[PDB]
A and B are shown apart, each in its own frame.
Chain A
């Protein structure tokens, strides 16, 4: 929605063909970005 580019996208879709199930997990808690600010990271191009 925000303009950009997905690097090596098709090679990903290839791997993705050979997968049946994902389990999303948390690796870098958003909460824990103490020094910097994450909450202020939005755009009209990607609205909700």
Chain B
């Protein structure tokens, strides 16, 4: 939908990422593997949990109807009573539906940016050092092991440590050597 990610360029979610809502998958000399981003799932849960309790709180003053008894020749205020309570019970039933319909749209879109903002986070760290492969995934120039994955995972990668390594690879898969 709105933000571009879920059901977007990242075609399909993974069943293998069991521990959390968004996360990482890597592939290197040592292993392959999935790893949920807890930090940012835990932040998304905070926000959904708050949404759920938001509603609950908002409908404790909602219209309570205790009944009234009515006569044979009071028929037309008996009705007035019935028109009212049926009235309010329609107005609050509408409200409770529409709010859900509205919050559900907002919630599914909340995940949609959650994912994308993660990706763009990874992207802004790894710059020239990696290829944007265009399907949710990056391949590095410099070859990056497990300890170095973590840094990307926990957002403290170091560009100017693998620079040469990487830009020796850029330098060459640019066919620039091929003139000597």
Contact = CB atoms under 8 A, between A and B. Distances in A.
Interface of A: 9-10, 13-14, 17
Contacts of B66: 17
Contacts of A9: 71
A10 B69 CA distance: 6
Nearest to B68: A14
Interface in B25-51: none
Interface of A is mostly: helix
Query: How big is chain B's contact interface, by range?
Result: under 10
A14 B69 CA distance: 8
B17 to A, nearest CB: 58
Interface in B69-104: 69-71, 74
A27 to B, nearest CB: 27
Contacts of B69: 10, 13-14
A17 B59 CA distance: 25
Nearest to B70: A10
Nearest to B69: A10
A15 B114 CA distance: 57
A13 B71 CA distance: 12
A14 B68 CA distance: 7
A17 B69 CA distance: 11
Contacts of A14: 68-69
